[PDB]
Design a protein around this ligand. Sequence first.
Ligand SMILES: COc1cc(NS(C)(=O)=O)ccc1Nc1c2ccccc2nc2ccccc12
Ligand SMILES: COc1cc(NS(C)(=O)=O)ccc1Nc1c2ccccc2nc2ccccc12
Ligand SMILES: [Mg+2]
Ligand SMILES: [Mg+2]
Ligand SMILES: [Mg+2]
Ligand SMILES: [Mg+2]
Ligand SMILES: [Mg+2]
Ligand SMILES: [Mg+2]
Lengths: 668, 655
Amino acid sequence: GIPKLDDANDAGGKHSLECTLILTEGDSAKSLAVSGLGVIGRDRYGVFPLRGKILNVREASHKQIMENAEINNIIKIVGLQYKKSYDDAESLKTLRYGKIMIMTDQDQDGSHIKGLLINFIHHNWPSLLKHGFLEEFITAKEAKEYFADMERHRILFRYAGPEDDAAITLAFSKKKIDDRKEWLTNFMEDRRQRRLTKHLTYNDFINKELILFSNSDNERSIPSLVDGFKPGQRKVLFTCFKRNDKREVKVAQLAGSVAEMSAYHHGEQALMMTIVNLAQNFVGSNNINLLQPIGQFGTRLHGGKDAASPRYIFTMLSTLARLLFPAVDDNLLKFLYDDNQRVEPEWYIPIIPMVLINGAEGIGTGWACKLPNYDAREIVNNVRRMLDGLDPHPMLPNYKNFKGTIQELGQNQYAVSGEIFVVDRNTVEITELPVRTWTQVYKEQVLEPMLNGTDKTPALISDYKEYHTDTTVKFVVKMTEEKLAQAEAAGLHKVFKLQTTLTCNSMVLFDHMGCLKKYETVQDILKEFFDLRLSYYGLRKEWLVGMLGAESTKLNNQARFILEKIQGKITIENRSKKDLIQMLVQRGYESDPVKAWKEAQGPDFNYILNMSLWSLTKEKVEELIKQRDAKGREVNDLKRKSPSDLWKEDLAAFVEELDKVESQERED
Amino acid sequence: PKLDDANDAGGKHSLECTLILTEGDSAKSLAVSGLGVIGRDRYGVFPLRGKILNVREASHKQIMENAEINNIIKIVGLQYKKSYDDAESLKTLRYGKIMIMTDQDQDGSHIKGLLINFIHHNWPSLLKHGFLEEFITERHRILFRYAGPEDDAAITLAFSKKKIDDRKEWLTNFMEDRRQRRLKHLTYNDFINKELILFSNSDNERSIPSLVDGFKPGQRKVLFTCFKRNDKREVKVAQLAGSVAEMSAYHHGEQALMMTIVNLAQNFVGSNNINLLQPIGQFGTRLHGGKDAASPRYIFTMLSTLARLLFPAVDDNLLKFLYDDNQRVEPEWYIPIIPMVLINGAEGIGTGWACKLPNYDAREIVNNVRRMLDGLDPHPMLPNYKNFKGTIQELGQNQYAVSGEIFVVDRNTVEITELPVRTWTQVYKEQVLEPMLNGTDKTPALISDYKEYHTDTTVKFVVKMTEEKLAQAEAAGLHKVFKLQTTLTCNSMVLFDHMGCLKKYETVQDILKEFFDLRLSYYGLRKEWLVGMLGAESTKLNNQARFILEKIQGKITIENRSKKDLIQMLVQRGYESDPVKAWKEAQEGPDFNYILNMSLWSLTKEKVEELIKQRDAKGREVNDLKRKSPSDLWKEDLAAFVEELDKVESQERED
DNA sequence: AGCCGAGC
DNA sequence: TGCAGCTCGGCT
DNA sequence: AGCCGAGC
DNA sequence: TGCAGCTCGGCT
Ligand SMILES: COc1cc(NS(C)(=O)=O)ccc1Nc1c2ccccc2nc2ccccc12
Ligand SMILES: COc1cc(NS(C)(=O)=O)ccc1Nc1c2ccccc2nc2ccccc12
Ligand SMILES: [Mg+2]
Ligand SMILES: [Mg+2]
Ligand SMILES: [Mg+2]
Ligand SMILES: [Mg+2]
Ligand SMILES: [Mg+2]
Ligand SMILES: [Mg+2]
């Protein structure tokens, strides 16, 4: 079921240079293109669908170029020849089509695909672009009307000088990473400032269109310092909070639900894989998985590649999630809008830097991000130290349930070791692989070549048996004692490849202001998170004091009303809204306190009059007095606490449950 | 599909080895996993990704090209025609046993049967040695045992094309024995008659629609979800499928929902006479009979305005909603105001029975329902397809001729302006006009040229011919020559009746009459329910009006009195315990909350006046309703539906 | 020989 | 019920 | 010569 | 982003 060409009738014959090959984004668009052309259109227009991102040929290997489906189909269809230059009219007589018309989604990923296509032709046949060989096109009845007016939707790329060569090269050469950081830096800065046509050159296309994809790539791929999330991830968590599921949801159904509630504009299978990623809890994945892995979500045996299909596995929130992201704090977040639907916030504000717990990592354009896992209790403890004006201890990466060793070689430089021990003089036991070394891989890339030997080396070991579980590693290895002697004389950890380095010189993240920023040490990250989170505890307090104050005023008025009613001092019986409103005002009743507070962020006495008739009864009077006083005491107790104290209460509540859950995990 | 061959497979311990066939990759994954380290020596795992070929009467070419069959043959080293009677013969096999490991559900069992069918047909001897076993979900290993000729009959009964009438009797008996009831080794015979029959039956339940609403359970779940969701904006189909799956506890692949949803939204000539979902996007055309629908991820839908008009919301109160795992789901059926099983032409393929019904005109059905409300006999009906421009005429009992349109323009030219229903434009072009133009290896060219002037929803061919050929064509009969006549035969109108029983209907009038009697009494039930409910509301309002009035005239006080004292006081003064709660109770101390929950606003002048007005309006509302007959209520509905039908259908002709 | 459609 | 290769940067 | 993951 | 072949009964 590979992609299928619908070849123009006149292709490869007398009228080849008059034929256009339409390259579309996916097969639906191919079907619609074909029906919009109709029978008369099929003469000079072919259609072939590209099913996703294609090879960057500029510095790909010869193998990749030879073996690539899309690249090679384009060549056969068009009749291109490597190394041929198309300078003359004469040279063009060997082509089956005279131009390619790119027809992709009018979105950023669409633009990326135009780029890769441009990159392709530019790298191999620049002499073609001089002839103007590339064009773009920017319900089946709607597709027919579009095509009858083809010329009005048809843009022609023009080559206009070396500035085009440089633009294309800037965007796609592996040698141009630093130029792209500069390019995008100028873009990003230029954009925060502003906050305060038949022909299209390649230069303009790169700098006015493709750059939008490049910036979007960064926005979806590089996590926020604040909550450790990428936008898709944040959309999943937002949906899960809103749904509040108390039994397991199938992952595919959760995916679709996230897509609806959060206005997710991409393929739901990306959402699915993301969900699987958030739930994983095997060694080297998440230190705290926010979703529960209910079913086969992958094991350390294959690094999670052995997860079952999203249609057959289930998940729900961890009991730790709302402890980490307290509900009350949602009141302080800037929620985003998409199509005037309210969606996920700009960022959540967790009580500890989640960006460090689960080890953010993404690859963008210009930058990429990698951070290892850090230990949660160790981070809780440093937040506590900072809350008391003490210095934070330095911190080593730490991966939950990892039995091995992480040693600091230098700044952002670590050696990571598994565990091997000598049992007898014929036997070693391997009980830990280094973090991110998966069991099957180690077995086939290390133990097998040791058993069988290679052409380069003779067999070092004699036998090995496996006694693993789903979550632990046990290899028993037999060796002649002469052989054991040598391996032991060399490094055991060395000979058996149980040492890997870990290097973190690209801790790139979006700061709370949404600016892309490079962090030298996790200390910087912790400090920047800390000032912000402390500040937001100030806000939570301001918000609560205001709110609870209004609720107290509200209750004072309500209680006063009831009491005066039963005492005969007011009557409302058979009196006009007009007379009642003014009567309340003159008796000094406050307009709705909670509404007036919410606004500040005629007089309204509905809060009083909407009360039920039960309110006047004996028990309901006593109860309202108790509520009024309770609420008064609530406001005051809270005015006395500091933001630090609030933070500490959260920390204590989180840790308590982290103990239960993790203790539970070690027995389940 | 990847095999994981057993380490000792094909060698000398071949017969000690066991090939585990699974239903799906995740299953093979879990099986390869759970085999442990030592399991790799003696056990192979190979996944089947779904229903396999029924080889018992398949063509030679089918058997020869089938991926699953031939993979299993290679892996086990089976050889056609080779008898495996003795010890010697068994040496060639690379495995000694096949262990079938399917889902523990009906479809699972069906795959088991297809596998049994396959081995039994080609190598019956192999089963006499006990070749096959299963893993139900070491004490999970069940062995299939051949115990005599009654096992050959049981397998043949389930899988032979020659045994449709026997399956009919088979399933009939099962259905009766279950209806009356509603008050380790394993022989093949017992497998077929105790396990496989469960699939056969629920295959019918999911494939053959109900008479009452013309839905199958999957369709019905879609509708249920759509009503609950109540969308005002379009929804992506793929997302709607998942939403349906979740809200109605659907236990199958969501891609099937997606196609079902698409099938319900289609409105091209030949599909639905009234599409209940809207086709927002490319959902298919008459050009390709819908096979040109785009992907479910890129098309959208929402309810048609006619949906709640055909399935009035108030009627939901009379339905029997089912339960799946503590969760309340769709009803056993909806009760529409006209028989939808006839409008949209229900059709489905089961085991033993199938169902085919053609479409009937909606207005003609409304008129017939009107005649019946008057005690007249319904006019006979003919199949009728919205926007079909041809002719459908009776040839006999449940047999019809369906004709397209062709006419001679001049002595060289004919126009074809309509194709028989269900003849798709592209197919007609490739399979008729092209051969007629180019000739074939067999037939000669008939025409000299043709040109197309189709719109998206109509058909227009202009054909050129020499005078000689045209005359010959007229002689033979134009409709016959250009294949513009189809017959339609309807001797398989099988449906589930309102009571759950599978039934054959000889005439559409019988379906109509049955549906009518049922819908009429549900209007009886709707009236009863409305009178009781509006009634209780009126009592409620009276009491509230009475309290508010007594309070205002100081004849009662609640101020500072205890809850015990208040309730007693209300009882003494003859106030009623919650009337609406009492009536909902009778649908199978004193509650006065409906009074004391009223707000203090209730005591103010304008609110006193307003409550008085509402009380009187409710009394009149009860009376206006008691004055209407079940029959009058039905007629109101039909009038409203028809008004909207005209509006909708007129806007389509304009768009 | 293949279409119709709800399942794998 | 499953599966079909790439992009982009850092680093190994 | 390939892994990490959010996209097509 | 797509695509891979079958069951089952009644007809054409
Ligand atoms: C037996 O069923 C299948 C076998 C294979 N194997 S192979 C070697 O041909 O590739 C592959 C797929 C299936 N089953 C299929 C489906 C199963 C579940 C849900 C949808 C399916 N859609 C299919 C579409 C075409 C072909 C097989 C499908
Ligand atoms: C260029 O992208 C694709 C090309 C093909 N063509 S071919 C001849 O190899 O079969 C096929 C698929 C793709 N794109 C893919 C995806 C696109 C969107 C969403 C998920 C995709 N998953 C893929 C998985 C494997 C291979 C290609 C995929
Ligand atoms: Mg797109
Ligand atoms: Mg992770
Ligand atoms: Mg199943
Ligand atoms: Mg239909
Ligand atoms: Mg690379
Ligand atoms: Mg058949």
